[PDB]
Structure 1
Amino acid sequence: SIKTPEDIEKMRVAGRLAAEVLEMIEPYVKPGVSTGELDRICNDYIVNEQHAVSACLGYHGYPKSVCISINEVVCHGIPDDAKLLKDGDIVNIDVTVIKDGFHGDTSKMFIVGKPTIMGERLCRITQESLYLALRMVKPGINLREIGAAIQKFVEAEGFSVVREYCGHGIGRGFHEEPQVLHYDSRETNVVLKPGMTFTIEPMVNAGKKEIRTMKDGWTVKTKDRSLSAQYEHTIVVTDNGCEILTLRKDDTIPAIISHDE
């Protein structure tokens, strides 16, 4: 699907709101706070101030407003009032907002209190694998190349790439074509074109790539219980590159990546 300039403008707004949620929640990610409380703050902010709504709530039955994953949890962790954060924890908060009918999906890592050396390294490499993919996006490039580039980098830095979950198209629909794998697959063959909008959300494990899903049907963990990190951005392919729709002040990459001279 190719988004019109109208659709794209609406996605800038939605993406911006999703990013502002992460920028707002940051000071609250402290030792002692529960993930259930972090979820309420995000939701109250999304509904009461941004006047938008979470796309996560109700999606295939998802019970909360944002996904919060800690340490070995790979993704889709469910906020809970009894789960408290502690020093060393690495935490991902994934936000998806719907505004004016369009989605904005983004997530970032937060390290609680005193960081662990490997925890910091894992988050750093994960974010760079996303940045690397983002600087690649431009018409002509194949999604298979993007996934191969992410995997090559991640593996060269001593980590692994989760295969089961991937990025995805997005717009009026939460998940739309195409699938955005973060590794090289023979299944992938998609030449990017301007107007396409999708997400890139690499999940990187400190240990092995294998994962497992808990009985709740949502919580995904690393099979070997090693740490897992993830960063995600929503973008739109431009005539000569791409525009990040969910950029935050702490991002060290500009919103528009143009390959023009």
Structure 2
Amino acid sequence: STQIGGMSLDQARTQLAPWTQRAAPIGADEYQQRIERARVLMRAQGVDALLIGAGTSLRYFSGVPWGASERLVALLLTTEGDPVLICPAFEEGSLDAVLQLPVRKRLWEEHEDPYALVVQAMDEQHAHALALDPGIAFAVHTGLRAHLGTAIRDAGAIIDGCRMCKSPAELALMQQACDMTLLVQRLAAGIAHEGIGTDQLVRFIDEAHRALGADNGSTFCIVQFGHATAFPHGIPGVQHLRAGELVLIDTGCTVQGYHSDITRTWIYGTPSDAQQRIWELELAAQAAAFAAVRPGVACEAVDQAARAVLQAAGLGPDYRLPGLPHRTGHGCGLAIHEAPYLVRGNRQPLQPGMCASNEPMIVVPGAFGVRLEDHFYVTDTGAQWFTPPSVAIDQPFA
């Protein structure tokens, strides 16, 4: 009965001191190890240059945490020497302040062509086999094509083959973000009451992540009530809570860029039989997916394990509704969604240090949905939860 409702704003505020179990930042040597692993995968693929654009992969490789813009900010890695950092001249100051890796800077004034610098740096090292970051804007392919006549490969296999398996230091940053968001989830369930707005919960979760010391409040937040829980990614519009509705809250933060991403679905007031039944089936499907995880297991096998529970209960098969209309889970790291994907058709074997969500949501069309989301990482012999799963329809927190 006790986790849902009855907590005031300022009672909740009393649990929101800055978080004091702070994981260490990624250190210099770890950035060099990332570069070295990228070089190994480059040579494996027969490529001799890699271009990484601003975003999660530039951060991974260099520390630079800036979002992509219309101006090319990029790392060009070749098989030897400090990687080249292509960046607007006016930003040099700022760049030097966030860089965690020694680089050769190649700066361009506003009217200069930054893609000519990439190719000039290629030509300097006799590199003629470029792989380009699949996350980068298409525009960069156009700019490179004005100067570069050889095939441009997709760098996805190189990037994933680095980022998929998390180091201990990555796992602890993730763990920190997750503990923080779990606390936030718990307090939002506490402050809930008849008539509370979805927007009031969203603003609260944001204030709470901030108080705790997230990099930037809530990375995202989804709050849905009642029938609106039937849409995996929700519909526009504010709702107000009523007894008898499910509440689905999916939110997360970052800590040094590393993401949490947790969904809780709980009853406010008394559940129907149908709500209970679906809610227990969801917990069961999530548990079977977790139980399937260890080294060597194909990513699709984990998704299949979830569907097997649904299907033994008369749901599915496949994506059929009522059932699980989307994949079981996604990888998580510096990006909310990254490889590997726990999806039908993905033969990728799971390996120690891989991180993914386990969120086999059930949708009952016309009625509601239940999504329980906790992330795990693969160990040497099985998996570990970052956050323990829910206990019951009215006990969202183990």
> TM-score, length-normalised on structure 1?
0.78
Task: Confirm or deny that 1:54 pairs with 2:215.
Answer: no
Deviation at 1:85, TM superposition (A): 1.0
1:35 has 2:176 as partner: no
Task: Decide which structure has greater helix share.
Answer: 2
Instruction: Choose between structure 1 and 2: higher strand proportion.
Output: 1
Q: C-alpha distance in 2, partners of 1:110/1:168? A: 23
Assess if the C-alpha contact under 8 Å between 2:355 and 2:376 holds in 1: yes
**Residue 166 of structure 1, CA deviation:** 4.5
Between the aligned partners of 2:353 and 2:293, the Cα distance in structure 1 is 12
**Structure 1 residues 139, 13: CA separation in 2 closer, same or farther (over 3 Å shift)?**
same
Structure 2 residue aligned with 1:220: none
Displacement of 1:51 in angstroms is: 3.6
Partner of 2:313: 157
* Cα pair distance change 1:79/1:34, threshold 3 Å: farther
Tell me how far apart the structure 2 counterparts of residues 129 and 249 of structure 1 sit (CA, whole Å): 13
Secondary structure of 1:149 counterpart: helix
Check conservation: 1:34, 1:84, Cα contact below 8 A.
yes
Other-structure match for 1:74 = 231
Check the 8 A contact 2:325/2:363 in 1, yes or no: no
Q: RMSD in angstroms over aligned alpha carbons? A: 2.2
Match in the other structure for 2:274: 118
Deviations 1:224-251 (A, max 9, x none): 4132110001111111111111236858
Residue 202 of structure 1: aligned partner: 360
**Hey, what's the Cα distance between the residues in 2 that align with 1:162 and 1:248?**
18
What is the identity percentage for the equivalent residue pairs of Structure 1 and Structure 2? 24
- Report runs of 4+ in structure 1 exceeding 4 Å deviation: 248-252
Conserved? CA contact 2:363–2:370, under 8 Å: yes
Q: 1:154 to 1:71 in 2, by over 3 A?
A: farther
Partner of 1:221: none
Structure 2 residue matching 1:54: 3-state secondary structure: coil
Q: Which letter maps to 2:338?
A: E
CA contact (8 A) 1:91 1:112 kept: yes
Separation (CA, whole Å) in 2 of partners of 1:238 and 1:200: 16
* 2:381 paired residue among 240, 247, 257: 240
What's 1:191 paired with?
A: 349
Aligned ranges for residues 95-114 of structure 1 at < 5 Å?
A: 95-114=251-270
- For these two proteins, the number of residue pairs brought into alignment is 222
- Look at both structures and tell me which one has the larger radius of gyration over its CA atoms: 2
Q: Which runs of 5+ in 1 are unaligned?
A: 57-65, 207-223, 256-261
Residue pairs, 1:248-259, within 5 angstroms: 250=391
TM-score of the superposition, structure 2-length normalised? 0.52
Shift of 1:100: 1.8
Q: Residues of 1 paired with 2:270 and 2:165: CA distance? A: 45
Q: Distance in 2 between matches of 1:249 and 1:200?
A: 12
Tell me how far 1:163 sits from its aligned partner: 2.9
Change (3 A) 1:162 1:196: same
Matches of 2:389 and 2:256, distance apart in 1: 21
Other-structure match for 2:331 = 169
Determine if contact 1:105/1:246 at 8 Å carries over to the other structure.
Answer: no
**What amino acid maps onto 2:305 in structure 1?**
A
Question: Is there any run of 5+ residues in structure 2 with no aligned partner, and where?
Answer: 1-163, 317-322
